[PDB]
Amino acid sequence: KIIVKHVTVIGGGLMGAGIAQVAAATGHTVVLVDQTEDILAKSKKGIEESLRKVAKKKFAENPKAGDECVEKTLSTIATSTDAASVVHSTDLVVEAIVENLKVKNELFKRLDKFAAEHTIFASNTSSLQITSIANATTRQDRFAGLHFFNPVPVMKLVEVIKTPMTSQKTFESLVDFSKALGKHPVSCKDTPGFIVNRLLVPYLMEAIRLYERGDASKEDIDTAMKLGAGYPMGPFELLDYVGLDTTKFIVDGWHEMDAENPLHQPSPSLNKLVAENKFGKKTGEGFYKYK
Amino acid sequence: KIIVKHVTVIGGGLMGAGIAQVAAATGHTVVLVDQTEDILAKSKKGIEESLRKVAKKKFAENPKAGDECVEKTLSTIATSTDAASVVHSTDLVVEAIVENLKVKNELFKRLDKFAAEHTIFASNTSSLQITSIANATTRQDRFAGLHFFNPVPVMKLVEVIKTPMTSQKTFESLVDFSKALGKHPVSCKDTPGFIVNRLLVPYLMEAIRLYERGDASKEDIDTAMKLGAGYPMGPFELLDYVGLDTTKFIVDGWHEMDAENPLHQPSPSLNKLVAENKFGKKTGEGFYKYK
């Protein structure tokens, strides 16, 4: 077995920054990648703040212990603008960039040329088939899905997605990496939505439709699911939380691939809010208004 | 206004006994009705057992008061095998008997004739349209749905279902009664599944279909929804908890009412388990095995 030690995370966004943070907090050597030195300086800054925040809470009685912790983690996170320049010596590539098939494929097709033989490639995509991306390389046996959830440093789940090509060796290594990250890996075929989103998102849509249909208010629907089902957040609160634009995007993809399917039918209320640029807590307003 | 004080609960079952227990515990006068004295004696005994389990904890420092509290609450619950003789002057009738439109309609058609003028009629049905029972009487303005959740004495939620004929006065009276019960009422029209089941059940079926499709194991699916969505129980753990037969029965109802909708398509796996009488925890086995 080849133990994942060096990880190259591509994408300075919220997801990739958190993936890097957790990988580094658990002793992995990390290289975060994005287009500009400024974008990277900012991403790594978000990580620093997150770490100090977790520090002033873990070592709330010993600031020095906290500084050392933060420092030790932040030091094992390097940054580069061209991933091709570091994958020749990396054990794992975790991609978390724009949800565009062409862009992702161009990325992996090139990295395939630089990455060492044993290097494994994984995408954190929520809206594309892992296979579609794997076939942009001739390393499909070492390519798979590694799907995290926001906030990455907190959510313990990680879906390890195997395509009909991924090798058992690649899978196991990713299962071990997940555990090494302090996460709990689960397995799912390379089908749309995998497990979590496949069961969560359609439900959220139903909540929206029941509301649009006028059967009940958003407030009661949230109250109903929190008190009646024990959910941390009612569906509308959660929609605003995960992003209305993010939600609409995933569902549009499922709808495009299967229009006759009523479960992916667009929502006038969802589309309207996204068109009015009300993405939820991201913009201070979605179904509900925020401070 | 119409302040509910005397309540007639029809159905010695788990739910009915729970409604009776909570109404009595909150200072309402209660009459629990069922078919035989043996049934009643049993149901009332369960209530006492549940009431005592609670007291031993809350009144540990003063067992005297605890016993008094349990006794007071018990004496406030009466029993009868003749609903017609009880409803002559009761304020509210909460029906929680067998999920069968015929039986329910005979009971109400009968009670409508013996009940006082102001008396309100309500059903705790999960598998039937409230309107399909209210018409079995000529008191539709005082007929509505009052949907509770097991364990009734614990679950603070209650859905108040107002049909197109239901009075605003009846609705409000039911809303105040719910608060008087120490519950939190939410409103919803008389549509299948109301709020909670409408959004919960179909999701549970989707988890089953995902598993039957061979996409993931039950174990990973439950882990995914708990760690990934923060749910108290995984979908299969919850199916066993709420009863596989109970679930199947409701889905069959929705399926027959509209065999076109994909969400209500029968599950071969669900049907099999029900067939071989494996309804979940209330049987020691369903998707998982217990004790």
Side-chain angles (χ1 to χ4, degrees), chain A residues 1-70 72-291, chain B residues 1-70 72-290:
Chain A
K1 290 187 175 185
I2 308 172
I3 299 178
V4 172
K5 289 298 180 181
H6 183 293
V7 178
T8 304
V9 172
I10 304 182
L14 193 60
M15 298 292 302
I19 295 177
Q21 190 181 312
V22 182
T26 51
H28 300 80
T29 303
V30 180
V31 175
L32 180 63
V33 170
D34 215 308
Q35 312 185 184
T36 292
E37 299 184 65
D38 297 318
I39 297 177
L40 288 169
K42 186 181 178 183
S43 295
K44 190 171 182 180
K45 178 186 175 182
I47 293 180
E48 191 177 315
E49 307 185 309
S50 174
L51 294 172
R52 296 184 185 297
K53 189 172 180 177
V54 177
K56 297 298 181 183
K57 184 177 182 179
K58 180 182 177 182
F59 304 85
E61 299 308 305
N62 182 310
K64 180 188 176 185
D67 300 331
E68 306 187 308
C69 182
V70 177
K72 186 173 185 178
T73 297
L74 209 59
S75 66
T76 70
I77 297 179
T79 58
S80 300
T81 53
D82 192 328
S85 65
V86 304
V87 298
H88 189 63
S89 55
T90 197
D91 307 305
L92 173 67
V93 172
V94 183
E95 171 278 304
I97 62 179
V98 194
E99 297 285 61
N100 178 291
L101 186 54
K102 297 181 181 178
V103 178
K104 285 174 161 59
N105 289 42
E106 174 181 59
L107 173 65
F108 279 112
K109 185 176 183 177
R110 175 166 177 273
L111 292 185
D112 191 29
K113 303 179 177 182
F114 297 76
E117 287 180 58
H118 78 293
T119 300
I120 294 174
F121 292 178
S123 174
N124 174 59
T125 184
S126 298
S127 50
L128 302 178
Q129 295 174 57
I130 301 300
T131 297
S132 300
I133 306 179
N135 293 328
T137 77
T138 58
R139 177 189 294 258
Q140 302 97 312
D141 61 301
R142 281 145 291 167
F143 200 115
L146 194 63
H147 193 236
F148 300 71
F149 299 79
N150 180 61
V152 185
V154 174
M155 306 302 293
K156 306 302 177 183
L157 186 67
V158 61
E159 298 174 298
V160 178
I161 314 304
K162 188 174 182 178
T163 70
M165 302 171 296
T166 307
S167 70
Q168 182 54 47
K169 180 180 184 179
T170 290
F171 176 64
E172 284 181 50
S173 179
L174 294 175
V175 166
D176 292 332
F177 176 59
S178 299
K179 297 181 183 176
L181 290 178
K183 307 298 189 187
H184 197 82
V186 294
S187 171
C188 183
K189 285 178 185 169
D190 176 42
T191 54
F194 309 140
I195 301 177
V196 180
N197 292 324
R198 177 65 178 73
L199 302 176
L200 178 63
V201 177
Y203 146 61
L204 300 179
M205 294 303 303
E206 284 294 71
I208 301 174
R209 302 189 182 93
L210 182 157
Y211 164 59
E212 292 183 294
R213 197 159 58 225
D215 303 325
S217 69
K218 290 169 297 181
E219 294 64 32
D220 289 349
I221 297 179
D222 293 328
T223 299
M225 304 310 295
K226 282 184 292 176
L227 303 189
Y231 294 179
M233 286 181 290
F236 293 104
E237 315 179 310
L238 182 58
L239 275 169
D240 286 356
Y241 183 76
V242 303
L244 302 186
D245 62 310
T246 308
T247 296
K248 185 194 183 309
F249 187 71
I250 290 179
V251 180
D252 289 315
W254 299 339
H255 178 57
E256 182 187 303
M257 296 306 303
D258 189 344
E260 296 180 60
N261 192 313
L263 298 182
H264 308 310
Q265 293 304 301
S267 169
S269 299
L270 183 54
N271 296 331
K272 189 172 187 299
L273 286 172
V274 177
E276 294 182 58
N277 204 286
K278 301 175 180 178
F279 304 163
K281 294 182 64 63
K282 292 181 179 182
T283 62
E285 168 173 36
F287 283 101
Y288 297 118
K289 297 177 182 179
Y290 304 78
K291 182 183 180 180
Chain B
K1 285 188 174 181
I2 309 171
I3 306 185
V4 175
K5 300 186 178 180
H6 183 287
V7 185
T8 294
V9 174
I10 299 176
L14 182 64
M15 299 277 288
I19 299 175
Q21 174 179 166
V22 182
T26 55
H28 297 74
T29 297
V30 182
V31 182
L32 183 59
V33 178
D34 215 311
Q35 304 170 64
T36 71
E37 299 287 16
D38 289 59
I39 293 174
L40 287 166
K42 297 181 178 182
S43 303
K44 193 175 183 178
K45 180 185 178 181
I47 299 182
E48 193 195 318
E49 304 184 306
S50 173
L51 290 177
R52 287 183 175 297
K53 178 184 177 182
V54 176
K56 287 297 182 178
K57 309 172 185 177
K58 184 177 180 179
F59 295 71
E61 293 308 303
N62 179 48
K64 173 187 177 181
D67 295 301
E68 304 181 305
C69 177
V70 174
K72 178 176 183 179
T73 301
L74 268 309
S75 67
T76 303
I77 300 180
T79 59
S80 169
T81 57
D82 178 38
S85 66
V86 175
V87 303
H88 182 292
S89 186
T90 190
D91 304 311
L92 168 62
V93 175
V94 179
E95 170 276 306
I97 67 176
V98 67
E99 295 285 51
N100 179 299
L101 183 57
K102 184 176 183 178
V103 183
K104 283 172 162 53
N105 288 178
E106 178 194 302
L107 176 64
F108 282 112
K109 181 181 178 181
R110 194 179 187 303
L111 295 178
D112 181 48
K113 303 177 181 177
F114 301 69
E117 187 175 301
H118 71 298
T119 299
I120 294 178
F121 283 24
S123 176
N124 177 60
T125 189
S126 296
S127 57
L128 301 178
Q129 301 174 300
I130 303 299
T131 305
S132 293
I133 305 179
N135 290 308
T137 69
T138 65
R139 181 192 298 275
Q140 309 93 315
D141 59 301
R142 290 90 75 190
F143 203 116
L146 192 61
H147 200 223
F148 298 76
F149 300 82
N150 178 55
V152 177
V154 168
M155 303 292 288
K156 295 294 174 294
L157 180 71
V158 57
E159 303 173 301
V160 180
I161 312 303
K162 183 174 180 182
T163 71
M165 293 177 297
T166 302
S167 170
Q168 172 56 44
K169 185 180 184 182
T170 293
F171 175 74
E172 283 175 50
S173 176
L174 291 179
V175 165
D176 301 321
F177 176 58
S178 301
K179 296 185 178 184
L181 292 177
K183 297 300 187 197
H184 183 162
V186 290
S187 171
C188 178
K189 296 186 175 184
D190 180 36
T191 54
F194 309 132
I195 301 179
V196 180
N197 295 317
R198 180 59 175 75
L199 301 178
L200 177 69
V201 181
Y203 143 62
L204 292 178
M205 294 297 292
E206 277 304 72
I208 298 178
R209 304 193 182 81
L210 175 61
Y211 168 63
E212 308 192 78
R213 217 147 51 210
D215 298 330
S217 66
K218 283 139 50 186
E219 298 65 39
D220 288 329
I221 295 175
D222 291 323
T223 297
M225 304 312 296
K226 283 185 293 183
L227 299 178
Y231 294 177
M233 303 185 69
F236 297 89
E237 311 178 307
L238 182 63
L239 277 162
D240 285 350
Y241 181 75
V242 301
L244 304 189
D245 57 311
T246 311
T247 299
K248 182 187 181 308
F249 184 64
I250 293 172
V251 180
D252 291 315
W254 298 330
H255 176 54
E256 179 176 58
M257 181 176 57
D258 174 53
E260 298 298 299
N261 193 300
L263 289 175
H264 303 152
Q265 296 306 307
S267 170
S269 297
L270 183 62
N271 297 324
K272 177 182 180 180
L273 288 169
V274 174
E276 51 197 59
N277 302 299
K278 301 181 179 182
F279 309 147
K281 305 185 66 176
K282 71 184 179 189
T283 289
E285 184 182 305
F287 283 103
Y288 295 108
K289 297 176 182 176
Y290 312 78

